[PDB]
């Protein structure tokens, strides 16, 4: 089947296909499902047009689509110099020229993200579906960490994927982490930002492979099924084995009898070989556990491990080191909010960056230059639709505030800005000159309302609001067991189950949250033994 | 054939520039962003053998991200910005600077979006060492509002003007740079603007009856009054003075019904300015371009060359770089009038590319790097000089060498609704299939997945067709438009464009800027299928939905262990449909899974129906086959 067929035509380039985005290619449907043509004044121009056009088209489906090979051929110097013959491609085929692969590190990261994202979305969907039906699952089936394993060119890569936010993913390998900004596209793919560069990626899961498309290049990862180890498909109990330990078994023959669900299920062998059992008769079974190994003749896929032990690329960081100071506020605060909502790094990484987030926030909130920077952004974004009188007054007042920085009597003139705006509103122009003024000044109103008591009051307000987040969740899971509390939440939030899920998800990471809580108490009520109401 | 460049630095060195550009910020979205990236990347492959030698950064709102805007996937890097109206994301020049410095870029392209009409942006960028792909602010100032434009046009080879306040001018400055200092032209401003009730009449006495009075801040439905009489001038004049109280008002003569031509001007930073070719853009609806044509075939050679010369003289004396357009009003007797200079690349610029074998956005990039015109390849070919060389071009002596190749029609596909006016519509796309062909191409700002949101402008795609002459180009465009398929929640004005291109007035080139307005008032929204066929097709769609829902719900009940009675699984559906006030009542049944029978008033017709995987139906009705689609609305059925 076809999932997408988009040929971006251009000047002097066209083409046509026998199938549309909906539709497919069947058994009796010949190859050659489309043709591209490019015109130029001479050979070189025509080549250039063709190459670019081919690099820009998108064909996605179940079938494979030879395009990248054509590109590689057109970029080969022998073609461009017109030094070819009827045996050119045969010779090149025997030389193993199937190039045009992305860099390994990028491919590994992208495949990891696709696998983990599917696992996470399935967890969310199944858990939420259970909640809608009145079932409560425990808070370890709604995981935020996925283990991904991918083999590329014989090398096995093992990674963990987690999230610091709904859009911020972290890929961890061998103790090294990289951050990626991931956005879900409506067409099924993912938009990545990795090391500055952005990428559009797609994944298709096959029986034993993952097909990863990065831009217009394809990379294929093998899903390990090679060791020929018999594994329990489910949890349960082993009752007995059907055949002798050391006896030969053939594929399709039952070798073991297990029971889960109080309902007995046998187990057929996949491959023909000599079976030796690991677990003794009568044993607890976990899904994917090791039950019995089988010796085969090892046709291939021998020692396809050589486990990669290195570190992934790490140049950028997106930490806003010294960038404007009011953008840093938003950055660190949003990270901490997402911690409060349950998005937390793993063990050695958590509290290695959170402490820094807290320290940077405390420094930012005590800097007198923060509110004027906010004012700059909100005032500059709205030049028109503001009466000139109030505009001039505001600019003057904020300039005065800037002149008084580094002075004990320095206070943000929130009241004075509010005064001039309320003066113009006291004039009160009528009839579309009323509402325009009240609406195009709302950002300024918000800013001055935040800083009525100055940077001190604002600082305290922010930290308090985080503490309130904590209490908003954790006061609901007191008074009894997990399921009872969840049922209380379900019966309160009748019309929305995502709210319930959010409570559960954030409650799952309670310990890490408590670490943050203590750090935020110590930076607020530390060397200042006073408490307001 | 000995040039060996791999990086922009080497290119700048070899071609005699002074600024290297490796990263470009696009302060735009939609079509402009798409087109910029594509054209420049083609050029990049041509010179460097690397299609991604110049990286492009884009600013992404959450709206464009959710709508799966096409430019997002093409870009090399994206930065998020705040959403909403243009003043938070793209018309905020200070934000543009902030991004340009936060992400170290060497240039900023604005195109025909929202910032290229703000003269403050080039200043902000040049102060920080950032090359703007456009004019300097001094030109955009000298090209300020309308009074200054009309005045400054008259300092060199004087184009006729329809009394822009008056016909009075200033001294001669044929090829000298000057600013709009309010010492000499102040008199003209004092005549160009009015204060008292009887000041405007002094224009009316000379221009005649069709007087247009506008405030200096007029626009958006207010501040504009059209006087058709002589004695009613004081009424509407005082009205305009009340539309924008306190502001100066101006009076000008209203245009006649004639043609709107354009000249495309291109210029380097070394004082060389050339005229590429013109455009005829006289297909307009409420002063909005719909169809453009590249060879300006209405104007004779003498007068058209004169218009080109005037446009170039203006560009040279004012100090314009990179690219822009000069508009003229062409009267039927061979007399042109100056209208205005647009200081930016237009959306319809491919029209002159396709007949000149040039690339304008790439030319803008090369100009921004400080390369003169006589070293850019395509220009060198246009004047008959070897591309691989450095010899200068005498642009004045060889100005007869350039010649258009063929004729091009550009048709823009808008999102308005010709039914009940032209209200802009919006929503999701379900299919976008443009079947290109020889000498036809086009491109869109949205893909099959994705849509158009509230802040996403109209003009979501452009189709272009080339021919040897006018007739061939028309033929190509008509066929190609009849072959494309756009389906979604929104409405898509295409059929109207087809009806216009098939109209004899267009094909004989007997049109003016008021053609479409007159046709709109005559209620020309034709291109409807025959009624009987439409009735049958709508009946089949309604009945098929009802039957499939019955099957699905009944089968679902059976799976759950419920038994419903055998009268909720019906094989007959009653359908009622009103067309043009007439009500039609039909019954639909089946003789087989594929054979449907439509019955009305005791008469029956048989139809062979097959379900398509794309949601539509394949019909065979009276021999002829049809492909049909239905969308059910709140109170309407839309049958394609």
SS (H, E, C) A158-218: EEEEEECCCCEEEEEECCEEEEEEEEECCCCCEEEECCCCEEEEEEEECCCEEEEEECCEE
Q: Return d(Cα B447, Cα B68) in angstroms, integer.
A: 8
Contact A52, A45 (CB under 8 A): no
Where is chain A discontinuous (C–N over 2.5 Å), named by the preceding residue?
A: none
Which residues of B are less than 8 Å from A196 in CB distance? 77
Which residues of A are less than 8 Å from B448 in CB distance? 4, 6, 21
Experimental technique, in short, is cryo-EM
From A140's Cα to the closest Cα of chain B, the distance in A is 31
Candidates B485, B511, B478, B527; CA nearest to B615 is B485
Identify the residue whose tokens are 């952005």.
A198
Burial letters A95-110, b for 16+ CB under 10 A, else e: eeeeeeebeebbbbbb
Output the six-digit token pair for B441: 């191409």
B462: enclosing H helix or E strand = strand B461-467
Output the six-digit token pair for A302: 């021998």
Q: Return d(Cα B318, Cα B312) in angstroms, integer.
A: 10
What is the number of CB-based contacts under 8 A between chain A and chain B? 90
Residues 6+ apart with CB under 8 A from B533: B621, B626
Contact B458, A45 (CB under 8 A): no
A44: enclosing H helix or E strand = helix A43-56
Q: Return d(Cα A510, Cα A506) in angstroms, integer.
A: 7
Output the six-digit token pair for B337: 């009038």
Give the CA distances from residue B532 to residues A427, B403, B525, B584, in Å, rounded to whole numbers and listed in that order: 65, 52, 19, 10
B421 is in an annotated binding site: no
Q: Return d(Cα B116, Cα A459) in angstroms, integer.
A: 41
Give the residue on B whose Cα is nearest the Cα of A24. B613
SS3 B10: helix
User: Would an 8 Å CB–CB cutoff place B95 in contact with chain A?
Assistant: yes
Contact B437 A14 (CB under 8 A): yes
HSE-CB at B142 with a 13 A cutoff on CA atoms is 20
B340 is in an annotated binding site: yes
SS3 B90: coil
Residues 6+ apart with CB under 8 A from B382: B356, B357, B358, B401, B402
Contact A14 B440 (CB under 8 A): yes
Active-site residue flag, B225: no
Which residues of A are less than 8 Å from B354 in CB distance? 11
Give the CA distances from residue B81 to residues A427, B87, B120, B128, in Å, rounded to whole numbers and listed in that order: 35, 11, 20, 21
Candidates B402, B447, B603; CA nearest to B68 is B447
**Rounded to the nearest 5 degrees, what angle is found at the Cα of A134, between the Cα atoms of A128 and A135?**
70
User: Would an 8 Å CB–CB cutoff place B431 in contact with chain A?
Assistant: yes
Determine the length of chain A.
533
Q: Return d(Cα B560, Cα B577) in angstroms, integer.
A: 36
CB interface of B with A, residues 49-68, below 8 Å: 51, 65-66, 68
Candidates A499, A472, A505; CA nearest to A132 is A499
Q: Return d(Cα B547, Cα A382) in angstroms, integer.
A: 56
* Header resolution in angstroms: 2.5
Q: Return d(Cα B402, Cα B475) in angstroms, integer.
A: 27
**Rounded to the nearest 5 degrees, what angle is found at the Cα of B25, between the Cα atoms of B23 and B26?**
140
SS3 A90: helix
Contact B90, B114 (CB under 8 A): yes
User: Would an 8 Å CB–CB cutoff place B45 in contact with chain A?
Assistant: yes
Give the CA distances from residue A274 to residues A240, A244, A291, B281, in Å, rounded to whole numbers and listed in that order: 18, 10, 14, 82
Q: Which of B73, B95, B437 sits opposite A200 (nearest CB)?
A: B73
Q: List own/partner pairs for A164-170 with CB under 8 A and 24 or more apart.
A: A164/A335, A164/A338, A164/A339, A164/A343, A164/A344, A164/A345, A165/A334, A165/A335, A165/A338, A165/A343, A166/A338, A166/A343, A168/A338, A168/A343, A169/A113, A169/A116, A169/A117, A170/A345, A170/A349
User: Would an 8 Å CB–CB cutoff place B88 in contact with chain A?
Assistant: yes
CB interface of A with B, residues 28-87, below 8 Å: 37, 48-49, 51-52, 55-56
Give the residue on B whose Cα is nearest the Cα of A40. B357
Contact B441 A13 (CB under 8 A): yes
B344, B375, B380, B412: the catalytic one is: B344
Q: Return d(Cα B109, Cα B541) in angstroms, integer.
A: 49
Candidates A505, A509, A512, A513; CA nearest to A489 is A505
Best B64, B73, B117 member to test A by mutation, with max A CBs in 10 Å, is B73
Give the residue on A whose Cα is nearest the Cα of B466. A11
Which residues of A are less than 8 Å from B353 in CB distance? 11
Contact B438 A187 (CB under 8 A): no
Residue B519 CB coordination number (10 Å): 18
A436: enclosing H helix or E strand = helix A435-440
Give the CA distances from residue B215 to residues A389, B199, B208, B221, B574, in Å, rounded to whole numbers and listed in that order: 22, 14, 20, 12, 60
SS3 B57: strand
Q: What is the dihedral of CA A512, A513, A514, A516, to 10 degrees?
A: 90
Which residues of A are less than 8 Å from B464 in CB distance? 11
Residue B589 CB coordination number (10 Å): 16
Identify the residue whose tokens are 């113009």.
A424
From B289's Cα to the closest Cα of chain A, the distance in A is 22
Q: Return d(Cα B356, Cα B340) in angstroms, integer.
A: 24
From A205's Cα to the closest Cα of chain B, the distance in A is 21
Which residues of A are less than 8 Å from B441 in CB distance? 9-11, 13-14
Give the CA distances from residue B134 to residues B12, B40, B140, in Å, rounded to whole numbers and listed in that order: 19, 16, 10
From A200's Cα to the closest Cα of chain B, the distance in A is 6
HSE-CB at A438 with a 13 A cutoff on CA atoms is 11
Q: Return d(Cα A97, Cα A70) in angstroms, integer.
A: 12
How many helices (H) does chain A have, and how many strands (E)?
16, 20
Give the residue on B whose Cα is nearest the Cα of A322. B102
Best B436, B446, B480 member to test A by mutation, with max A CBs in 10 Å, is B436
Q: Return d(Cα B498, Cα B463) in angstroms, integer.
A: 12
SS3 B193: strand
B223 is in an annotated binding site: yes
Best B31, B57, B115, B447 member to test A by mutation, with max A CBs in 10 Å, is B447
From A235's Cα to the closest Cα of chain B, the distance in A is 28
Contact B15, B375 (CB under 8 A): yes
DSSP structural state of residue B493? B
Candidates B164, B207, B160; CA nearest to B331 is B160
B534 is in an annotated binding site: no
Contact B350 A10 (CB under 8 A): no
Candidates A440, A344, A15, A186; CA nearest to B64 is A186
Q: What is the dihedral of CA B459, B465, B470, B471, to 10 degrees?
A: -110
């Amino acid at each position: 089947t076809v999932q997408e067929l988009n040929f971006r035509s251009n000047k002097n380039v066209w083409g046509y296909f026998s199938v549309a985005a909906a539709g497919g290619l069947h058994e009796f449907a010949d190859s050659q499902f489309g043709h591209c043509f490019s015109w130029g004044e001479n050979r070189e121009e025509a080549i250039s047009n063709m190459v670019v056009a081919l690099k820009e088209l998108s064909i996605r489906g179940d079938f494979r689509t030879t395009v990248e090979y054509l590109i590689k051929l057109l970029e080969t110097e022998s073609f461009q110099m017109n030094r070819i013959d009827t045996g050119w491609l045969d010779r090149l085929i025997a030389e193993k020229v199937q190039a045009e692969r992305p860099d390994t590190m990028l491919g590994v990261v992208c495949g990891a993200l696709h696998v983990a994202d599917v696992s996470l979305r399935n967890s969310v969907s199944n858990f939420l579906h259970s909640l809608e039906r009145g079932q409560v699952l425990p808070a370890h089936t709604l995981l935020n960490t996925v283990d991904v394993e991918l083999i590329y060119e014989g090398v096995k890569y093992v990674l963990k994927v987690t999230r610091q936010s709904p859009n911020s993913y972290v890929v961890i390998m061998n103790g090294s982490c990289v951050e990626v900004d991931v956005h879900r596209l409506s067409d099924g793919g993912l938009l990545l930002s990795y090391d500055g560069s952005s990428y559009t990626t797609y994944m298709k899961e096959e029986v034993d492979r993952y097909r990863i498309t990065i831009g217009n290049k394809t990379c294929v990862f093998e899903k390990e099924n090679d060791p020929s180890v018999m594994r329990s498909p489910s949890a349960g109990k082993l009752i007995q084995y059907i055949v002798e330990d050391g006896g030969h078994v053939f594929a399709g023959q039952c070798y073991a009898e297990i029971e889960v669900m109080k309902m007995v299920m046998t187990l057929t062998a996949v491959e023909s070989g000599c079976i030796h059992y690991v677990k003794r008769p009568g044993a607890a079974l976990d899904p994917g556990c090791v039950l019995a190994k089988m010796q085969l003749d090892n046709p291939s896929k021998v020692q396809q491990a050589e486990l990669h032990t290195g570190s992934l690329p790490r140049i950028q960081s997106t930490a806003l080191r010294g960038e404007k100071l009011h953008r840093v506020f938003h950055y660190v605060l949003d990270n901490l909010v997402n911690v409060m909502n349950g998005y937390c790094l793993p063990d050695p990484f958590f509290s290695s960056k959170v402490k820094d987030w807290v320290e940077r926030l405390m420094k930012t909130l005590r800097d007198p230059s923060l509110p004027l920077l906010e004012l700059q952004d909100i005032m500059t974004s709205v030049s028109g639709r503001i009466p000139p009188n109030v505009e001039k007054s505001i600019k003057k007042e904020m300039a005065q505030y800037a002149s008084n920085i580094t002075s004990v009597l320095c206070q943000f003139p929130s009241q004075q800005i509010a005064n001039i705006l309320d003066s113009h509103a006291a004039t009160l122009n009528r009839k579309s000159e009323r509402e325009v003024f009240f609406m195009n000044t709302q950002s300024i109103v918000q800013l001055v309302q935040r800083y009525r008591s100055g940077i001190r009051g604002h600082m305290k307000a922010v930290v308090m609001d985080l503490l309130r987040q904590y209490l908003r969740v954790e006061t609901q899971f007191q008074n009894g067991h997990y399921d009872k509390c969840v049922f209380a939440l379900r019966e309160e939030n009748k019309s929305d189950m995502n709210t319930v899920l959010n409570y559960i998800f954030s409650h799952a990471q309670v310990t890490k949250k408590n670490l943050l809580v203590t750090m935020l108490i110590d930076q607020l009520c530390g060397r200042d033994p006073t408490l307001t109401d | 054939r000995d040039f060996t460049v791999a990086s922009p630095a080497e290119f700048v060195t070899r071609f005699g520039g002074n600024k290297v550009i490796e990263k470009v910020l696009i302060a735009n979205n939609g079509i402009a962003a798409v087109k910029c990236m594509r054209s420049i990347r083609r050029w990049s492959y041509e010179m460097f053998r690397n299609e991604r030698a110049i990286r492009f950064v884009v600013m992404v709102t959450p709206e464009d991200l959710k709508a799966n805007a096409e430019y997002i996937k093409m870009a090399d890097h994206y930065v998020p910005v705040p959403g909403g109206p243009n003043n938070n994301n793209y018309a905020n020049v200070e934000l543009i600077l902030d991004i340009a410095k936060r992400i170290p870029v060497q240039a900023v392209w604005a195109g025909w979006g929202h910032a290229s009409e703000n003269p403050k942006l080039p200043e902000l960028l040049l102060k920080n060492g950032i090359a703007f792909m456009g004019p300097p602010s001094q030109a955009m100032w000298a090209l300020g509002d309308k009074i200054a434009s009309s005045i400054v046009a008259q300092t060199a080879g004087i184009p006729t003007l329809p009394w822009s306040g008056s016909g009075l001018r200033v001294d001669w400055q044929e090829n000298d740079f000057s600013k709009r200092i309010l010492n000499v032209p102040q008199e003209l401003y004092e005549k160009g603007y009015v204060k008292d009730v009887d000041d405007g009449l002094q224009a009316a006495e000379e221009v005649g009856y069709p007087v247009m009075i506008k405030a200096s801040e007029g626009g958006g439905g207010k501040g504009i009054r059209k006087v058709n009489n002589a004695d009613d001038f004081p009424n509407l004049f005082r009205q305009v003075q009340a539309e924008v109280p306190g502001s100066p008002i101006f009076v000008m003569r209203l245009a006649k019904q004639s043609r709107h031509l354009e000249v495309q001007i291109l210029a380097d930073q070394y004082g060389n300015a050339i005229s590429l070719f013109g455009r005829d853009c006289s297909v307009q609806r409420r002063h909005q371009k719909i169809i453009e044509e590249a060879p300006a075939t209405i104007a004779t050679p003498a007068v058209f060359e004169h218009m080109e010369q005037c446009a170039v003289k203006l560009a040279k004396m004012v100090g314009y770089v990179s690219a822009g357009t000069v508009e003229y009003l062409y009267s039927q007797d061979g007399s042109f009038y100056f209208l205005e200079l647009n200081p930016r690349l237009q959306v319809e610029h491919p029209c002159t590319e396709m007949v000149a074998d040039v690339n304008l956005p790439a030319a803008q990039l090369q100009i921004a790097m400080g390369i003169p015109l006589y070293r850019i390849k395509d220009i060198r070919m246009m004047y008959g000089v070897s591309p691989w060389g450095d010899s200068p071009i005498d642009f004045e002596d060889s100005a007869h060498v350039p010649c258009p190749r063929g004729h091009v029609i550009a048709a823009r596909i808008t999102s308005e609704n010709p039914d009940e006016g032209f209200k802009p519509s919006s929503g999701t796309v379900q299919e976008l299939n443009f079947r290109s062909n020889k000498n036809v191409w086009g491109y869109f700002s949205v893909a099959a997945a994705g849509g158009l949101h509230e802040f996403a402008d109209s003009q979501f795609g452009h189709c272009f067709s080339w021919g040897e002459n006018r007739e061939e180009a028309i033929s190509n465009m008509v066929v190609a438009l009849k072959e494309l398929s756009i389906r979604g929640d929104f409405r898509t004005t295409v059929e109207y464009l087809i009806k216009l291109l098939e109209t004899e007035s267009f094909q004989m080139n007997r049109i003016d800027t008021g053609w479409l307005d007159r046709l709109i008032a005559e209620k020309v929204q034709a291109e409807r299928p025959d009624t009987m066929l439409g009735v049958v097709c709508g009946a089949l769609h309604v009945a098929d939905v009802s039957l499939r829902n019955s099957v699905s719900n009944f089968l679902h009940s059976l799976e759950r262990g419920q038994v419903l009675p055998a009268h909720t699984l019906l094989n007959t559906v009653d359908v009622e449909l009103i067309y043009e006030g007439v009500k039609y009542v039909l019954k639909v049944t089946r003789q087989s899974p594929n054979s449907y029978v439509v019955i009305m008033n005791g008469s029956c017709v048989e139809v062979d129906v097959h379900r398509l995987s794309d949601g539509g139906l394949l019909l065979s009705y009276d021999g002829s086959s049809y492909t049909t689609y239905m969308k059910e609305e709140v109170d309407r059925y839309r049958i394609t």
